[PDB]
Each structure stands twice: as structure tokens, then as C-alpha cells.
Design a protein around this ligand. Structure first.
Ligand SMILES: O=c1ccn([C@H]2C[C@H](O)[C@@H](COP(=O)(O)O)O2)c(=O)[nH]1
Ligand SMILES: O=c1ccn([C@H]2C[C@H](O)[C@@H](COP(=O)(O)O)O2)c(=O)[nH]1
Ligand SMILES: [Mg+2]
Lengths: 263, 257
């Protein structure tokens, strides 16, 4: 009876991509025509440094500070949205519109940073473990930025998956939770500026950690249990933000909206 | 454009500020430290711009904050250039020696524009996409340890944005000392509280300051001092806690023995 590792099966990645398409479409219905590949690379760039800022990297300020690993988890998930969006758009881009950099050998467009102390890494050698270590984090995310510059969105997804497994959290479960917060934000005036993220005292991101305490690694990838497992996660997030039933969506509605779109 | 001998003197103030943080900074810091700092400041710069297509869609570029970030990147690139000069040759990262074409992919904005002489920074920098392509190029320059190229780009950036880079440097330099004095290292001092950020009080300290005052390779020492004093005054810093430009020069010359 074999154990399901932390790799995301193809079938599940498809479903993840359908959710992502739905969220992107809430933002702009023609998101593929409107967004550029550079947008997603930029967004990954910004989230990467925002992640690094969770570590005490600064030698001139706040010594005796420890990494804010709760925030690292959310930032990884944010990067995952943007890379998944980027990988999808890559597949949707015409060939004459393909940036030359995406096709040149990686070694030509990138320098791989390595930490000074011995460590293990992901299979590509871009991300370094343990990620509780600031120097490992720094080298990893300087590599992610350069991957984003060479449009390697699929390599990035792979790296995030190993990153989540090092840090010991359920990436897919967090994805579902953050996806749901993202949808909530779009329903509640994120664009026009009326939304309150740091409401009552806590950042809205911080409420998600409790919404996924129940879910298991297998439970969220098992072809039998996953739709239900994803749905309870969505429900937990919706309920936490006091979102009415009529405004909610379930995983199957997202699959239906995506399929309806491919026509 | 900053005469060579002025740049040489800014380097000495940077040296002095660096030694306040760690006495033997050149041995303690690494090339990667500076390249990372610039990377982190580069994205803080971009986040002054309304780059998010999903949130805050009529936000205004915060150009006042862009001036401050440009100046921080300047502190960090001066430090890197210095770090390079005192790094032994056999420890010089190989990427620094390659032609620029080999170590970067130059991001261009979609709409036509002018640029700096290298074609890395794009004008006007009031424009979000021009800013974005500029600082995604700066990050790549940082990765290749090209601190001197970065310094040149920042100078051209300041010129396009119409503010006085050297005056801003002296002001932020003064604030950095103030921070170290007030115990920034251990948390006794915070840079932002109740919607008041210390950098934001710098602008009124140097509003009046001419390009010619601060660059005149004859009468610039006095101009820098008056900036230093205005900033110290703006933060209510006692006289005995202040330092002047000649103190930092002397500090640096005495450290070079
Ligand atoms: O087209 C978009 C734009 C944004 N996001 C999501 C991805 C991240 O999880 C989240 C980050 O937004 P902030 O929390 O930083 O505002 O937004 C998308 O999924 N698609
Ligand atoms: O070795 C150092 C460390 C920090 N700084 C300065 C550069 C920036 O102007 C300023 C940024 O500090 P924060 O605003 O990030 O705290 O600190 C230096 O000059 N040298
Ligand atoms: Mg700054």
C-alpha cells in the first residue's frame, strides 16, 4: 500500500488550473488577452522579495528576529497562483509572441545562487533546504526571480511544491483557502479600495491557517475525496468571512465554468 | 551628472556610515549582501507604483517614495562598488566580468520611449510600465554585481524625475546615522508608526537645494553640512550627537591606514 508523495498529479493540477482561470476571470473576463507574460513574472518577482522579507535578512536592524514562517506559507501560495497563471498563459500564447528568453538554454539566462553552508536542494538545484534557514531562503528566491525572468513558470511550480514539503504544510489545501479569500476580496471592493484586509486587528490571510487544520495530504489529492475536501475548505473560508450562500461557489461550479469557457 | 570627484566623496560618507553599523564591514559583508539589498529596494521602489491589476486601480505613483528608494539603492550600490574594489581578484565573481549582453535579458516597455545610454532605464519614470522594465533590469544588474552601471542608471533616473540625487543622499545618509544612534539595531527606534514614516520628513529638509550647491567640487562640503544640520534639526538631535561632513571624511581617511 504505497504512500502518495508531494507531487501534484496531472489531473489535480488541471482542476487547480480551472479554479485559477475562474479567479483570473473574476478579475478580467478576457484575462488571457489582457494580461502579458511579463505581468506574471513581475508578480512572482514582487512576491518573492515579499517572502524574503519574512526572514531577518537585514544586518543593520532587528537582530534576534526569527523567520515569520506563517507568512512564508501564504507567500508561497501567492507565488503558486501567479506561476500557475503564467504556465497557463504560456500555453495560450501564439508562437510568434513567444519571448526568445523562454527558449534559450537556462544557463545562458541565469546564474544559480548557492548558499555557503552545505545543504540539500530540490531536483533542479534551485531551492535549498531547510527553508527555516534565511541564507537557504535567500539563495532560493533569488533563483526564483531569475526563473521568472526566463518565463520558466512550470519549473517554478515544481520548486514551490518541494518548498511546501520542506516547510511541512499542505500546499494544495492552502491554495484552496487563499483562492477562496481572493474571490472574497474581488466580491468586496478590492479594486475600488473599499476592502479592509487588516480588520479588527488581524490580517485576513492569518485566518486561513485555521481553515485547513483538518485536511490531509492524501485527502486533498485523492481522486475519490478531493472535491469534497476542497469544498469543506472553501466553506470554512466563506463562513469565516461571513459570506452569504448566494455569493459562494463550489469546486464543481468552477469546473463547469471552465468547461463552458472551452467552447 | 555627478562629477567623478563628488562620487569619490560620497563613497567616503558611505564608508563611514557602513563602519558605524559594523567596524570591519568590508570583511564582514559579502558582494551578495549588497546585490540582495538592491534587489529588495528595487521591488520596494516598484511597489510605489500602481502595478496591481486586481487591487487599488486608481492609485497614484508615489514618486516622493521613489526618490527615497532611488537613494537607498544608491547607498547599497556605492557599498557594492567599494566591496568589489577590495575583493581579491581570485574571489571576483565571474559574472561581473562578462559582457552585459551575456548576463541579462533587457526588458523593454511596450510603448516607445527614451532611455539612458545603456538602454536599461526608461523615461518618463512617471509611467508605471517604464518603471517596471527599468527595475527588472536593475535587479539583473545586481545579480551580475554591476554596481557601477547601477550608479550610472540611478543618476539618469534622478535626472529624468527632476530631483537632486546628491541632496537626497546626504539627507537619507543623515537619517541612517540618526537611526543607528537611536537604537535601530535592537528595536528602540522604529522607522514607521501611526502613519508617520521617518523618510517622509526628509523632503522638506532639502526642497530649496540647488544642483549647483551640492555638486560644486569647490563649495559642496558646506552645502552637505547645511543639509546634515537641517535633518538633525528636523529630528531634534542634540549637537554632541551630530557629525559633520569633515568628521566622516576624517573618519574615512584615518581608517585607510
Ligand atoms: O490575476 C490575478 C491577480 C491576483 N491573483 C492573486 C494571486 C495571489 O494569491 C493574490 C495576491 O494578492 P495580494 O494578497 O498580494 O493582494 O492575488 C490572481 O490569482 N490572479
Ligand atoms: O550597511 C548598510 C546597511 C543599511 N544602509 C542604509 C541604506 C538605506 O538607505 C537604508 C535602508 O534602511 P531601511 O529603510 O530598509 O530600514 O539603510 C547602509 O547604508 N549601509
Ligand atoms: Mg527604503
Amino acid at each position: 500500500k504505497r504512500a502518495r508523495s508531494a507531487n501534484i498529479p496531472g489531473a489535480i493540477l488541471h482542476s487547480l488550473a480551472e479554479l485559477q482561470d475562474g479567479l483570473n476571470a473574476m478579475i478580467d473576463p478576457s484575462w488571457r488577452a489582457v494580461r502579458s507574460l511579463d505581468n506574471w513574472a513581475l508578480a512572482i518577482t514582487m512576491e518573492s522579495t515579499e517572502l524574503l522579507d519574512s526572514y531577518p535578512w537585514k544586518w543593520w536592524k532587528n537582530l534576534n528576529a526569527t523567520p515569520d514562517l506563517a507568512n512564508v506559507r501564504i507567500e508561497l501560495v501567492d507565488i503558486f497562483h501567479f506561476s500557475l497563471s503564467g504556465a497557463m498563459q504560456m500555453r495560450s500564447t501564439p508562437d510568434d509572441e513567444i519571448p526568445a528568453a523562454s527558449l534559450k538554454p537556462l544557463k545562458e539566462v541565469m546564474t544559480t545562487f548557492l548558499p555557503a553552508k552545505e545543504c540539500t536542494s530540490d531536483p533542479y538545484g534551485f531551492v535549498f533546504f531547510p527553508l527555516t534557514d534565511t541564507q537557504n531562503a535567500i539563495a532560493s528566491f533569488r533563483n526564483i526571480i531569475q526563473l521568472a525572468n526566463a518565463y520558466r513558470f512550470d519549473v517554478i511550480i515544481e520548486c514551490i511544491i518541494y518548498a511546501a514539503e520542506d516547510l511541512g504544510f499542505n500546499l494544495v489545501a492552502y491554495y484552496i483557502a487563499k483562492h477562496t479569500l481572493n474571490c472574497i476580496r474581488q466580491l468586496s471592493g478590492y479594486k475600488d479600495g473599499s476592502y479592509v484586509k487588516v480588520n479588527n486587528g488581524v490580517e485576513d490571510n492569518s485566518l486561513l491557517h485555521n481553515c485547513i487544520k483538518d485536511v490531509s495530504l492524501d485527502e486533498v489529492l485523492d481522486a475519490d475525496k478531493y472535491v469534497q475536501a476542497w469544498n469543506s475548505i472553501m466553506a470554512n473560508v466563506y463562513e469565516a468571512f461571513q459570506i452569504k450562500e448566494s455569493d459562494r461557489k463550489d469546486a464543481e461550479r468552477w469546473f463547469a465554468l471552465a468547461k463552458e469557457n472551452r467552447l
